A paper describes a structure:
Coronaviral Mpro is a 3C-like cysteine protease that cleaves the viral polyproteins (pp1a and pp1ab) at evolutionarily conserved sites to release non-structural proteins which are essential for viral replication and transcription in host cells. Due to its indispensable role in viral replication, evolutionary conservation among coronavirus genera (alpha, beta, gamma, delta), and absence of mammalian homologs, Mpro stood out as a promising drug target for developing pan-coronaviral therapeutics. In this study, we present crystal structures of Mpro from the feline coronavirus strain FECV-UU23 in complex with four clinically relevant inhibitors: GC376, PF-00835231, nirmatrelvir, and ibuzatrelvir. Our structural findings reveal that the active site of UU23 Mpro maintained conserved catalytic residues in addition to distinct, lineage-specific structural plasticity, especially in the loops forming the substrate binding subsites.
Analysis of the UU23 Mpro cocrystal structure with GC376 revealed covalent bond formation between the aldehyde warhead and catalytic C144, as expected. The P1’ position was further stabilized via water-mediated hydrogen bonds of the backbone oxyanion with H41 and G142. The γ-lactam P1 group of GC376 established multiple hydrogen bonds with residues F139, H162, and H163 in the S1 subsite. The flexible leucine-like P2 group was restricted into the S2 subsite mainly through hydrophobic interactions with L164. Notably, in this complex, two water molecules coordinated interactions between GC376 and T47, further stabilizing binding of the P2 group in the S2 subsite. These water molecules are missing in the SARS-CoV-2 (beta-CoV) structure where the P2 moiety has a slightly altered orientation and the S2 subsite is more hydrophobic and smaller, mainly due to the larger M49 and Q189. The P3 benzyl moiety was bound in the UU23 Mpro active site in a conformation similar to that in SARS-CoV-2, with conserved hydrogen bonding of the backbone with E165. This interaction together with minimal vdW contribution from the S4/S5 subsites oriented the P3 ring proximal to the γ-lactam. The overall conserved binding mode across these variants is in agreement with the overall broad-spectrum activity of GC376 against coronaviruses. Our results confirm the lower nanomolar potency of GC376 (IC50 ~12.4 ±  1.3 nM) against the FECV variant, reaffirming its established efficacy against FIPV (IC50 ~130  ±  20 nM) and SARS-CoV-2 (IC50 ~26.4  ±  1.1 nM, 190  ±  20 nM) as well as broad-spectrum inhibition of 3C and 3C-like proteases including Mpro.
Numbering used by the authors:
A (entry chain A), B (entry chain A): 1 to 300
The structure:
Amino acid sequence: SGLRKMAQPSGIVEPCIVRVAYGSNVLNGLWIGDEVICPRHVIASDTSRVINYDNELSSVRLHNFSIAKNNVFLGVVSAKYKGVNLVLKVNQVNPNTPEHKFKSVKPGESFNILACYEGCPGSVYGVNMRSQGTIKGSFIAGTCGSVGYVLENGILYFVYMHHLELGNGSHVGSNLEGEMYGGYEDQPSMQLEGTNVMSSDNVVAFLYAALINGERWFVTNTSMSLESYNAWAKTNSFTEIVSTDAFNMLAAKTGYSVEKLLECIVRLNKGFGGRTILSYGSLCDEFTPTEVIRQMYGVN
Amino acid sequence: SGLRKMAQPSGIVEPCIVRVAYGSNVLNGLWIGDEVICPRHVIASDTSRVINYDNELSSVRLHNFSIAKNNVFLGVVSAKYKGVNLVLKVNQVNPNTPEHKFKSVKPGESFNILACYEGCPGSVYGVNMRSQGTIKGSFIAGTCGSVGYVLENGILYFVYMHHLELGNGSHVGSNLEGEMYGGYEDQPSMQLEGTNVMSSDNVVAFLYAALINGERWFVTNTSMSLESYNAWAKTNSFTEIVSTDAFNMLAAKTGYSVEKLLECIVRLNKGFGGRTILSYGSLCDEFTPTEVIRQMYGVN
């Protein structure tokens, strides 16, 4: 039993991480095939002030890139912006390139961060995309270009590359096509995150995990209809539930309907009264139904 | 900024994981050199009742072990108990054996779990050893033999192998020498965990992490001497602080003395008053000083 936020194993991704430096900027790149993908601000003269990315590309020189993995030094033969990323053609193919695909994650979806520090994989942890396109991680100077990935059905997808932190501490990155999640600019200027909308699907999964774990104190002899919950969610910064299909197995195994748990959300959002659920002191929307089923039942 | 419980990358460990089955029992083994190490209960006829491990070894047959990694099947040529583990000599050397050492972790120390499901590495997360020798993870049937490890100064240490869950949900395992942490028996019978003693060193590190993060609401114009704190800790299920050396850098960078944070512990242990620190609702002892310095400053 137990519920922990996990990451999928990082081995397949680690050999793709390189150090990319330009001038005094140092970050990470993703070396796949004969390309290195990294955040384009590595070439900016001064990342502490608003950047004119036209001017930075105008004055770039390919020779000034310093890209390395251990004792392998990679020369840049072509450089393009692709959205907020640089795509750098290099003079060597990564012999450890894994089979892979690219996709974008959506709000409420979980994925893995390989946190890399000036070219060195340092740690791995799980995240969940928030409604405004942000994650709550732990990133510092030297960790841009850290890679997010997810394995599905034996297929490796690259889904995230790290770019910046907002003034409220939320973390912002892009897909590997260089589209920033949430639409944020790759600038140091103040950008607001709007209101965080909790993932109702994930809160339902969390309450199911507690029930699987034998923790049932919060369930009452009450239950809320789906339309009723959705009308409440729309004014309480929770998402509307569009389908209950993701909960069929959880409901069958625990014996608790989704609607009982919807009533629990509305009641518990007012506060836990000093109690905890799975050691949390308030509702948690970081776990998907899939994540809960996998770690608590060991299936799909 | 931010603080997350992380794991060190798992790639070096993943190629060492094998499926070990005997009869109807299925768990994981650690294949290093020409040895596979696994929990000895894989050979027990009925793990739901007290096991006479003499009787199970008496009736073992080497041919009945089924050990595999992908399309590699390993034959057992010798079997010994070493404490609560089996050490199995096999007929092939693991060509992906990493350089490694063995050591034991101590209460308050962090390490990484590679959670493995019937021979397949599934996920990786960080843990911290509790005073009674337990961890709070997420383990289910099929995950025994999952491996705990820590990288220090480029050296890989294997430190934990998973065996059982106590009635209160705490997780129990052994070192790779087969000594069970906490002294628990590898039996399904009720075993109590005594009182959990919080790691004061780690709580101090957690409060420093909050201060590094710019969260300072909980500090007051008060400070508690070291002997005074230790007398309080001894009757409040916290460890005594033996040395402040681990906090020199944290204190220098934040400007806050250890003694200010000791006063914070005594005050906050009575409750956070509905507030949070780094999103937690009560004090957290899962992070070491080293962990905080590494992820928040990127040093050693």
